[PDB]
Motif scaffolding. Structure first.
Motif, PDB file in Angstrom:
ATOM      1  N   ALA A  19       8.733  23.489  13.467  1.00 33.89           N
ATOM      2  CA  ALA A  19       9.955  23.027  14.138  1.00 33.89           C
ATOM      3  C   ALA A  19      11.097  22.714  13.156  1.00 33.89           C
ATOM      4  O   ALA A  19      12.278  22.829  13.522  1.00 33.89           O
ATOM      5  CB  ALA A  19       9.646  21.805  14.999  1.00 33.89           C
ATOM      6  N   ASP A  20      10.777  22.292  11.905  1.00 34.14           N
ATOM      7  CA  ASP A  20      11.805  22.039  10.869  1.00 34.14           C
ATOM      8  C   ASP A  20      11.180  22.266   9.497  1.00 34.14           C
ATOM      9  O   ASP A  20      10.841  21.319   8.768  1.00 34.14           O
ATOM     10  CB  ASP A  20      12.412  20.644  10.955  1.00 34.14           C
ATOM     11  CG  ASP A  20      13.567  20.445   9.960  1.00 34.14           C
ATOM     12  OD1 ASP A  20      13.928  21.379   9.195  1.00 34.14           O
ATOM     13  OD2 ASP A  20      14.141  19.345   9.965  1.00 34.14           O
ATOM     14  N   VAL A  21      10.939  23.543   9.207  1.00 33.49           N
ATOM     15  CA  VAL A  21      10.363  23.947   7.926  1.00 33.49           C
ATOM     16  C   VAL A  21      11.130  23.334   6.749  1.00 33.49           C
ATOM     17  O   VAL A  21      10.518  22.827   5.804  1.00 33.49           O
ATOM     18  CB  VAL A  21      10.311  25.489   7.833  1.00 33.49           C
ATOM     19  CG1 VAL A  21       9.825  25.916   6.457  1.00 33.49           C
ATOM     20  CG2 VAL A  21       9.443  26.081   8.953  1.00 33.49           C
ATOM     21  N   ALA A  22      12.468  23.375   6.774  1.00 29.67           N
ATOM     22  CA  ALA A  22      13.248  22.926   5.617  1.00 29.67           C
ATOM     23  C   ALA A  22      13.110  21.423   5.378  1.00 29.67           C
ATOM     24  O   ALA A  22      12.959  20.981   4.227  1.00 29.67           O
ATOM     25  CB  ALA A  22      14.722  23.305   5.793  1.00 29.67           C
ATOM     26  N   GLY A  23      13.192  20.616   6.441  1.00 31.04           N
ATOM     27  CA  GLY A  23      13.026  19.176   6.268  1.00 31.04           C
ATOM     28  C   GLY A  23      11.638  18.815   5.775  1.00 31.04           C
ATOM     29  O   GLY A  23      11.471  17.940   4.907  1.00 31.04           O
ATOM     30  N   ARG A  45      16.060  25.157 -11.753  1.00 29.58           N
ATOM     31  CA  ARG A  45      17.301  24.878 -11.067  1.00 29.58           C
ATOM     32  C   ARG A  45      17.288  23.481 -10.529  1.00 29.58           C
ATOM     33  O   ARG A  45      18.326  23.007 -10.085  1.00 29.58           O
ATOM     34  CB  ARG A  45      17.411  25.939 -10.022  1.00 29.58           C
ATOM     35  CG  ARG A  45      17.654  27.357 -10.579  1.00 29.58           C
ATOM     36  CD  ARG A  45      17.702  28.222  -9.340  1.00 29.58           C
ATOM     37  NE  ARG A  45      17.987  29.652  -9.430  1.00 29.58           N
ATOM     38  CZ  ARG A  45      17.338  30.822  -9.584  1.00 29.58           C
ATOM     39  NH1 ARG A  45      16.072  31.053 -10.039  1.00 29.58           N
ATOM     40  NH2 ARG A  45      18.220  31.804  -9.353  1.00 29.58           N
ATOM     41  N   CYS A  46      16.106  22.798 -10.606  1.00 28.52           N
ATOM     42  CA  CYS A  46      15.868  21.493 -10.041  1.00 28.52           C
ATOM     43  C   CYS A  46      15.506  20.431 -11.074  1.00 28.52           C
ATOM     44  O   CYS A  46      15.471  19.231 -10.734  1.00 28.52           O
ATOM     45  CB  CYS A  46      14.726  21.549  -9.014  1.00 28.52           C
ATOM     46  SG  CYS A  46      15.070  22.413  -7.450  1.00 28.52           S
ATOM     47  N   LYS A  56      17.615  15.371  -2.099  1.00 27.18           N
ATOM     48  CA  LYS A  56      17.898  15.713  -0.707  1.00 27.18           C
ATOM     49  C   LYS A  56      19.179  16.541  -0.577  1.00 27.18           C
ATOM     50  O   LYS A  56      19.304  17.362   0.343  1.00 27.18           O
ATOM     51  CB  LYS A  56      18.041  14.442   0.135  1.00 27.18           C
ATOM     52  CG  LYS A  56      16.866  13.616   0.339  1.00 27.18           C
ATOM     53  CD  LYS A  56      17.195  12.427   1.233  1.00 27.18           C
ATOM     54  CE  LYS A  56      16.040  11.480   1.443  1.00 27.18           C
ATOM     55  NZ  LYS A  56      14.972  12.176   2.261  1.00 27.18           N
ATOM     56  N   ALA A  57      20.140  16.362  -1.489  1.00 28.78           N
ATOM     57  CA  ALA A  57      21.360  17.169  -1.448  1.00 28.78           C
ATOM     58  C   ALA A  57      21.176  18.568  -2.036  1.00 28.78           C
ATOM     59  O   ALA A  57      22.023  19.442  -1.798  1.00 28.78           O
ATOM     60  CB  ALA A  57      22.488  16.458  -2.195  1.00 28.78           C
ATOM     61  N   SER A  58      20.094  18.803  -2.789  1.00 26.29           N
ATOM     62  CA  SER A  58      19.941  20.029  -3.569  1.00 26.29           C
ATOM     63  C   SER A  58      19.699  21.231  -2.664  1.00 26.29           C
ATOM     64  O   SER A  58      18.688  21.293  -1.955  1.00 26.29           O
ATOM     65  CB  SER A  58      18.787  19.883  -4.562  1.00 26.29           C
ATOM     66  OG  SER A  58      18.497  21.111  -5.200  1.00 26.29           O
ATOM     67  N   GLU A  59      20.603  22.210  -2.718  1.00 20.08           N
ATOM     68  CA  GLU A  59      20.356  23.449  -1.988  1.00 20.08           C
ATOM     69  C   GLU A  59      19.172  24.206  -2.569  1.00 20.08           C
ATOM     70  O   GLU A  59      18.394  24.810  -1.824  1.00 20.08           O
ATOM     71  CB  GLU A  59      21.617  24.316  -1.987  1.00 20.08           C
ATOM     72  CG  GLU A  59      22.743  23.681  -1.156  1.00 20.08           C
ATOM     73  CD  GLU A  59      23.918  24.624  -0.915  1.00 20.08           C
ATOM     74  OE1 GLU A  59      23.784  25.844  -1.176  1.00 20.08           O
ATOM     75  OE2 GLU A  59      24.966  24.135  -0.434  1.00 20.08           O
ATOM     76  N   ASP A  60      19.020  24.192  -3.895  1.00 19.52           N
ATOM     77  CA  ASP A  60      17.913  24.898  -4.525  1.00 19.52           C
ATOM     78  C   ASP A  60      16.570  24.296  -4.128  1.00 19.52           C
ATOM     79  O   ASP A  60      15.618  25.029  -3.833  1.00 19.52           O
ATOM     80  CB  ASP A  60      18.099  24.895  -6.038  1.00 19.52           C
ATOM     81  CG  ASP A  60      19.298  25.727  -6.474  1.00 19.52           C
ATOM     82  OD1 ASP A  60      20.135  25.195  -7.238  1.00 19.52           O
ATOM     83  OD2 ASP A  60      19.373  26.913  -6.069  1.00 19.52           O
ATOM     84  N   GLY A  65      11.599  24.652  -0.906  1.00 12.67           N
ATOM     85  CA  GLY A  65      10.646  24.081   0.030  1.00 12.67           C
ATOM     86  C   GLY A  65      10.363  25.051   1.159  1.00 12.67           C
ATOM     87  O   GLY A  65       9.215  25.183   1.617  1.00 12.67           O
ATOM     88  N   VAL A  66      11.400  25.777   1.599  1.00 15.85           N
ATOM     89  CA  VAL A  66      11.143  26.762   2.649  1.00 15.85           C
ATOM     90  C   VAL A  66      10.303  27.920   2.107  1.00 15.85           C
ATOM     91  O   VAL A  66       9.419  28.446   2.800  1.00 15.85           O
ATOM     92  CB  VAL A  66      12.462  27.273   3.254  1.00 15.85           C
ATOM     93  CG1 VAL A  66      12.170  28.439   4.194  1.00 15.85           C
ATOM     94  CG2 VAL A  66      13.181  26.147   3.990  1.00 15.85           C
TER      95      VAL A  66
END
Ligand code: HEM
Length: 153
Positions: A19-23, A45-46, A56-60, A65-66
């Motif tokens: 339901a929310d893979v990214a979170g 990159r992290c 939590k702000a990191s796009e990378d 995580g996805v």
């Protein structure tokens, strides 16, 4: 080999993840990096990230995580019939990223932690034991392929 019922408990809580893979992927990686900061060094990159808010702000970090949860969910849905899915993953993690099995243990711990935290009603003792067995099987099989590739990690 897990029982069919154990696989169904694994896949039942995994639907909640989907339901929310990214979170979920953010929480899992942040838990890994907090509990085992040496793992953060593996991600170019992290690896400069310092605070939870930065992570939590990191796009990378969110993208990665996805990446992890997408690959792992496909593996889990094979119900142990995952040789074709592990082959590329063993390839890159043995020879390029150099991820020891103990780091796979750390991330398995983080997965279990986040699933328990977010879905306790779908992650009682039955489901936790099933997920533990599934991740143990993943780590066993990928360790065998690591060695086939010359990596003793
Ligand atoms: C459930 C366990 C894991 C899964 C399913 C997984 C899956 C993936 C996938 C699909 C990729 C992209 C394709 C590839 O390079 O193979 C990747 C990349 C990567 N993984 Fe893993 N991984 C896992 C655990 C770990 C752990 C524990 C670490 C380090 C502590 C790690 C380090 C990396 C790195 C450094 C990359 C390259 C990232 C980049 O440069 O973009 N992996 N992983």
């Amino acid at each position: 080999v897990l029982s069919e019922g154990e696989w169904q408990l694994v896949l039942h809580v995994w639907a909640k993840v989907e339901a929310d893979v990214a979170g979920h992927g953010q929480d899992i990686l942040i838990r890994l990096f907090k509990s085992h900061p040496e793992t953060l060094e593996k991600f170019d990159r992290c690896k400069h990230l310092k605070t939870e808010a930065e992570m939590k702000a990191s796009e990378d970090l969110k993208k990665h995580g996805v990446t992890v949860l997408t690959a792992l969910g496909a593996i889990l849905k094979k119900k142990g019939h995952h040789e074709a899915e592990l082959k590329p993953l063993a390839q890159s993690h043995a020879t390029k990223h150099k991820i020891p099995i103990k780091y796979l243990e750390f991330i398995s711990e983080a997965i279990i932690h986040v699933l328990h935290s977010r879905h306790p009603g779908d992650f009682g003792a039955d489901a936790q034991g099933a997920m533990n067995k599934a991740l143990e099987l993943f780590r066993k099989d990928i360790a065998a392929k690591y060695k086939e590739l010359g990596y003793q990690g």
